[PDB]
Amino acid sequence: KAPVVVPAGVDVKINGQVITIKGKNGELTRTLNDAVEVKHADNTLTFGPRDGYADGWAQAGTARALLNSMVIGVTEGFTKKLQLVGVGYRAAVKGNVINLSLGFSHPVDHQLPAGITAECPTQTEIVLKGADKQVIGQVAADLRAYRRPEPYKGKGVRYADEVVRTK
Amino acid sequence: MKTFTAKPETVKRDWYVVDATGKTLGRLATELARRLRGKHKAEYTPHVDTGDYIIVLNADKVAVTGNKRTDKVYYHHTGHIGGIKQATFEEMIARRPERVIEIAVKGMLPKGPLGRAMFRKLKVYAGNEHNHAAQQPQVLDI
Amino acid sequence: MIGLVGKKVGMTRIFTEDGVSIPVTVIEVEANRVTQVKDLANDGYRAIQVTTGAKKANRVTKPEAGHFAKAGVEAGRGLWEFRLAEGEEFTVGQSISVELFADVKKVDVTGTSKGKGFAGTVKRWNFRTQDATHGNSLSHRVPGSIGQNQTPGKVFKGKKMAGQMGNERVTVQSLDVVRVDAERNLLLVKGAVPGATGSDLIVKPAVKA
RNA sequence: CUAAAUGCGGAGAGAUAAGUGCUGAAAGCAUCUAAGCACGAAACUUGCCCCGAGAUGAGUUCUCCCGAAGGAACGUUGAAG
RNA sequence: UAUCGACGGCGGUGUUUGGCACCUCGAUGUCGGCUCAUCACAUCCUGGGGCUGAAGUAGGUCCCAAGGGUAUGGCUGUUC
RNA sequence: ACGUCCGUCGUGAAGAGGGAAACAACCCAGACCGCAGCUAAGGUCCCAAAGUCAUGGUUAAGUGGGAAACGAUGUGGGAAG
């Protein structure tokens, strides 16, 4: 059993295999179904199976991690800061598609998954914030992925790329 | 030696039901499928139709043995090999029941051999009394 | 009435002031008696008849609808006496071409192109021919190569060859309707129309003109 | 009738491998995996054309019919053979 | 350790050759070519990738993969 | 080398019957006829006669065993510093 205390600005309610966390930033509902019973104590969320098998500890390490993740994503939130760079032709990054990358006539794009905001001010910094973590991390990774030289041209010579400043 | 009634066996066509509700699914494979060619009447021979359409009450509650689960698997599909396996679990296809107690009493054709014909006879479906609503003729109860 | 149908009579022409002289295919479009209409559904990609509408059946027309809204409905054909029709069934089934057909209107006419037995690769699926001296070598309509690598002495199923045909459906689009005239209620279609004379061809308001 | 003649012969959609990643333990770190998950091959499935109720889940519809409904035989010719 | 790669060691295949000779030995018309049908892969490319003594271009080598395409001619009966 | 060539012995040849999926020499075992009973080999979820038997443990690969030299924190058990 691994008791997980909940912040003063966090309210969690559970009904069966469904756990809902509420707060300021928003709400996140997740389902944890396994050979364990997750219950919420007035001051702490408890997770404790009956057996201590290896596989049982595996689901225990992820469960606690997921819960703690739902807590931070409600009080603080998930946001990644990225910056664009280019020595030569300025890469115009728009909320739709990036153009003039290294001088290529054709635009490189990627579909924005789920519902997160990627507001990009006319400068060097851009922000991708959302409620889901697996989403804000994918979109941020793909944005740099496409900035990766497809042809057989090594790095160093091609600086142009929008890397993530902070995780 | 020869004793056949006029063509065919449809006028005054017989019919029989069972209680799909509760009981082994094994001893439900036999019967039903024996009500067809040679229902057990002096009107068999064998070369013309006989298939005596049967009815299934409820096919959802029909529980299996309390041991065998993801033990038995059914391979359903056709076409090229080494592609789509489509291997689902029994109590997974239970989302029905429409294609279950008809997948059985279906494996005995054996291979045309008159059996294709044998299928539209019975009408598998989950429910109860108001299920036999469809098809409207006299009434029994085995 | 998604469209009408007639029988190919032959090919003529009409010189109209506007536009310019152009051959026209005469098609006999007449009285029909559609008793019912069969609707097909697109399960994956295998046609299947959903239901059939009789002189009076709201239980089938309802399913027909909605399914159309789902865009799952396939081509529509209805039990007819002479030729097809759609909304014509609901009325009485009895109708004339004059009821459905206007001229100068664009329409899509599809039909099965015109038994010819076995044919040569060329006369067959349009295979070209031995141009150059290749023709001089009197090897006109022959691929010259049943298949690569003599061993296998086999011809890749792909490697198209000769075979049987006749006894292909094609839907030519943008077919202007010159006019409806002749000894009998017919239709004048601009250009040519797939299939031989007497063949059954259908009409349909040009999807895009 | 033919050819050294002429008109016609898609796109698109769906799914894995190599591989690229996500979340994440066993080893409270890390990790593409071990459970789970997002993508990802001219080929594969489909589209499309052709055959097909002997398509063994062996079809559908309408009408006629159980002493008279219907049907075979013939004659004159083929858009047929 | 891009690439080439000895000495030595350990193996797979059985297309070559050698061996044995267990089988056939109560007879299944030769070689080459041609014509026509099916199968396989130790992929020469197309497709997707790794490395480079990879600037680019053009190549070299290697991996997954055989779906398709892998197809021809001049001299010689001739298979080099 | 389903090789040649010796020796001892049991068999193939007159070993039927039974098991081994099928099988000349591998295992058990060696026959008058008819009848009852009990066993051998082997087998006891179904086809197939007989337990889907009891206690305990391991494997997940369906491994159900050509499969080699060689390799292996896939996983389980035991002992030693």
The DSSP code sequence of B35-48 is SSTT-SSS---SSS
Neighbouring residues of B69: CB distance < 8 A, sequence distance ≥ 6? B89, B90, B91
Q: For this experimental structure, what is the resolution in angstroms? A: 15.0
CB A66 within 8 A of CB A33: no
Q: Is the CB of B75 under 7 A from strand F?
A: no
C-beta of residue C64 within 8 angstroms of C-beta of residue C73: yes
Beta carbon of B71 within 7 Å of strand F? yes
Largest CA distance in chain C: 69
Structure tokens at B71: 């033990």
B76 backbone dihedrals φ, ψ, rounded to 5°: -115, 120
CA of A71, C1' of E79: distance in angstroms: 82
Contacts (Cβ under 8 Å, ≥6 apart) of A45: A3, A4, A6, A12, A14, A19, A38, A39, A67
Distance, Å, C151 CA → E25 C1': 34
Going along C154-204, which residue ranges are E strands?
163-165, 169-179, 186-190, 200-202
In this structure, what DSSP letter does residue B70 have? Answer: T
C174 token code pair: 């943008």
Q: Round to whole Å and give the CA distance between A1 and A5.
A: 13
Q: How far is Cα C175 from Cα B44, in angstroms, rounded to an integer?
A: 62
Residue identified by tokens 């019967």 is B31
Q: Give whole-number Cα distances, C209 to C83, C109, C174, C176, in Å.
A: 26, 13, 6, 9
3-state secondary structure of A60: helix
**Helical segments of B54-120, H only:** none
**Distance of CA A109 to CAs A10, A103, A119, C5, Å?**
38, 15, 16, 49
Report CA(C113)–C1'(E68) in Å, whole number. Answer: 30
Beta strands (DSSP E) in chain B are 16-17, 54-55, 73-75, 87-89
At A159, give phi and psi (nearest 5°). -70, -40
Phi-psi region of C90 (alpha: psi -120 to 50; beta: other; left: phi over 0): alpha
Helix (H) or strand (E) holding A83: strand A78-83
Tell the burial category of C25 from Cβ atoms under 10 Å away from its Cβ (0-12, 13-18, 19+): buried
Question: Which amino acid type is present at position A98?
Answer: I
Kindly compute the dihedral angle of the four CA atoms of residues A153, A156, A157, A159, in this order, to the nearest 10 degrees. Answer: 100
What is the β-pairing status of strands B54-55 and B16-17? parallel
**C125 in Cβ contact with C184 (< 8 Å):** no
Count how many domains chain B has. Answer: 1
Alpha-carbon distance of A74 to A22, in angstroms, equals: 7
What's the number of CA atoms in the CB half-sphere (13 Å) around residue C17?
0
Which nt is closest to the CA of C158, judged by C1'? E68
Q: Which of residues 124-153 of C touch strand E (CB under 7 A)?
A: 145-153
Burial of residue C26, with CB atoms counted within 10 A of its CB: 0-12 exposed, 13-18 middle, 19 or more buried: buried
Give the determination technique. Answer: cryo-EM
d(C-alpha C119, C-alpha C125), whole Å: 9
Contacts of A145-151 spanning 24+ positions with Cβ under 8 A: A145/A110, A146/A98, A146/A108, A146/A109, A146/A110, A147/A98, A147/A101, A147/A108
H/E run at residue A54: helix A54-75
Domain of B12?
1-142
Rounded CA separation C190/C176 (Å): 6
C123: which residues sit within 8 A by CB, 6+ positions away? Answer: C141
* Cα A16 to Cα A32: distance, rounded to the nearest angstrom: 9
CA C206 to CA A93: how far, in whole Å? 43
Question: Within a 10 A sphere around the Cβ of C170, how many other Cβ atoms?
Answer: 12
Place of tokens 């090999």: B81
Tokens of B138: 């006299």
- Identify the helix (H) or strand (E) that includes residue C41: strand C37-43
- Residue B105 tokens, joined: 């009493």
Chains that touch B (3 or more CB pairs under 8 A): none
Q: What is the domain partition of chain C in residue ranges?
A: 1-209
Query: Which single residue has its CA nearest the C1' atom of nucleotide D59?
Result: B117
Closest CA to C1 of C67, C97, C82: C97
Distance CA A119, CA A73 (A): 19
CA dist B4 and B6 (Å) reads: 7
Please provide residue C9's backbone torsions phi and psi, each rounded to the nearest 5 degrees.
Answer: -100, -45
Q: How many CB atoms lie within 10 A of CB C24?
A: 23
Nearest Cα neighbor of B35 from B20, B21, B49, B19 is B49
CA of B40 to C1' of F35 (A): 40
